[PDB]
Design a protein around this ligand. Structure first.
Ligand SMILES: O=S(=O)(O)C[C@@H](O)CN1CCOCC1
Ligand SMILES: [Mg+2]
Ligand SMILES: [Mg+2]
Length: 536
């Protein structure tokens, strides 16, 4: 058997993450000061007699600074009061911010708040084009709409054209904030990534910045970063002790990038165990993906797929040696998970992720069959297989394993493929298909998403790309609607699904596969989040 020649770029990180020794004196010093700053900030939030605009701006700043996870109760209380008081009497910047913050927190505020800013036709009043702060907040708000918000249909185009026009003449850091927002809106960004940018490039440079908030944000970011580096060290050692870099050299070596993905799903300290479990799964399924895509023969992949369905160490002998390596590692990893969850009495929940993994692998094998047979399915059939091969049903399920509050009912809800999950999966599918269409076409993949779309509807590549873009827009509206109260499960179990969608947007920004080629996009994020501390 002649295997195809390897082509993936090596890990660009070497061993620079393998050993991190926390400075406990510095960590304890940061924690002690943060306790004081946290209380000062709580008192700011609880201050009586604040105007609506000031209250919304304070909450917005605390959220962008990445320290709002300390104040979930306080912020919820305040937004709930604002939601139920229904003050519709403010300028564009306050109205748009009010709308965004409430919707992001699940409060279903009416989009009629924008009617006063529009003419008879429902188009935004062009007289608003000289209000830059209003336009910026309208821009950010436009990204949180649902299918019930067609009154905002014009908001993105309107805010964008006039922000672009205004930008070159704006003072700093407002200019940089506007320019950044046009590249990456807040709602669809990865939270730590946007937080790092906001602290260092914007708030640190604001003449009017609150010094207590800025110091709090910097110390908290850097303290959490120490935990993340410990986790990544622990994960780097685990990966090193598996040595797939040598024994499975056909596979993408990307455990740092996998860690960045897990960090995007949740960054908070209470999700430490969850992050570490999640990154191990992402790493391991990536090995399997490359095994199906770029090494295994038809016959091997069949045996591998069946072995995964039976999930039994007895089955290793049916596999070639190189497949024995990944197969044992997979079984062992899930045994690791079981032991890791044993003292909490949550071992039994591991079966949910295992069943999702089997699903991914069945559909990997279908994809391989289609490729060999030269089959181009209709779009409906394509999606019935290719949605699971995003791994996103699987990763969302995995994200719950380490979450201490996840119950059987939460897994049961997820198992039914709820709308918000389906939407996140679709976003991953269509954005990846758009970014990778050309290269996969070159590699002979006749069953690529765009190709299936072209043949099915009888339309150009351009038109198919556009249809896929529409599917993504529909899915984002479904995600936003999925966050609205009453939620079917606690919001805590929705945010990982939202964040998986965000990771798609961030990783394939500018229509490129950032996981396979991390140099352009992921490398700067990894450096900013996991290498460089924020200077104080
Ligand atoms: O080819 S897709 O299925 O469109 C995208 C997936 O390959 C992404 N991997 C990267 C690492 O996490 C698991 C999935
Ligand atoms: Mg693949
Ligand atoms: Mg692909």
């Amino acid at each position: 058997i002649v295997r195809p020649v390897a082509d993936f770029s090596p890990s660009l990180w070497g061993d620079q993450f393998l050993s991190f020794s926390i400075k406990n004196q510095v960590a304890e010093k940061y924690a002690k000061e943060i306790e004081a700053l946290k209380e000062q900030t709580r008192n700011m939030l609880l201050a009586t007699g604040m105007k609506l605009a000031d209250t919304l701006n304070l909450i917005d700043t605390i959220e962008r600074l990445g320290i709002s996870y300390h104040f979930e109760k306080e912020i919820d209380d305040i937004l709930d009061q604002i939601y139920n008081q229904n003050s519709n009497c403010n300028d564009l910047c306050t109205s748009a911010l009010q709308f965004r913050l409430l919707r992001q927190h699940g409060f279903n505020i009416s989009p009629e708040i924008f009617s006063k800013f529009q003419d008879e036709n429902g188009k935004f009043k062009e007289s608003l084009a000289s209000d830059v702060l209003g336009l910026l907040n309208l821009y950010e708000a436009s990204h949180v709409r649902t299918h019930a918000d067609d009154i905002l249909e014009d908001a993105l185009a309107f805010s964008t054209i006039h922000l672009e026009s205004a930008a070159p003449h704006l003072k700093s850091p407002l200019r940089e904030q506007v320019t950044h927002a046009l590249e990456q809106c807040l709602h669809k960004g990865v939270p730590r990534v946007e937080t790092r940018f906001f602290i260092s490039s914007i708030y640190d440079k604001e003449q009017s910045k609150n010094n207590v908030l800025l110091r709090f944000a910097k110390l908290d970011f850097n303290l959490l970063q120490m935990l993340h580096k410990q986790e990544l060290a622990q994960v780097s050692r685990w990966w090193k002790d598996l040595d797939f870099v040598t024994t499975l050299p056909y596979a993408r070596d990307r455990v740092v990038e996998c860690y960045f993905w897990a960090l995007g799903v949740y960054f908070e300290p209470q999700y430490s165990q969850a992050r570490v479990m999640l990154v191990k799964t992402i790493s391991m399924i990536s090995i399997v993906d490359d095994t199906f895509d770029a090494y295994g023969t038809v016959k091997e992949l069949e045996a591998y797929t069946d072995a995964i369905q039976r999930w039994d160490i007895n089955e290793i002998d049916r596999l070639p040696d190189y497949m024995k390596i990944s197969y044992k590692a997979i079984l062992d990893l899930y045994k690791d998970y079981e032991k890791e969850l044993s003292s909490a009495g949550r071992s039994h929940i591991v079966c949910h992720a295992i069943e999702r993994m089997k699903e991914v692998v069945r559909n990997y094998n279908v994809e391989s069959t289609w490729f060999i047979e030269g089959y181009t399915p209709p779009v409906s059939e394509y999606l019935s297989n290719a949605l699971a091969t995003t791994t996103y049903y699987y990763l969302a399920t995995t994200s719950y394993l380490g979450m201490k509050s996840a119950t059987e009912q939460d897994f049961e809800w997820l198992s039914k493929n709820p709308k918000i999950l389906e939407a996140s999966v679709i976003i991953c599918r269509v954005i990846d298909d758009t970014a990778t269409y050309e290269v996969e076409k070159s590699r002979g993949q006749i069953a690529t998403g765009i190709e299936c779309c072209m043949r099915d509807y009888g339309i150009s590549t351009k038109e198919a790309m556009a249809k896929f873009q529409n599917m993504a827009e529909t899915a984002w509206k479904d995600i936003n609607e999925g966050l609205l109260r009453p939620t079917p499960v606690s919001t805590e179990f929705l945010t990982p699904i939202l964040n998986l969608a965000r990771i798609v947007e961030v990783t394939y920004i500018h229509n490129l596969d950032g996981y396979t080629h991390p140099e352009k996009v992921l490398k700067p994020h990894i450096i900013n989040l996991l290498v460089d501390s924020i200077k104080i």
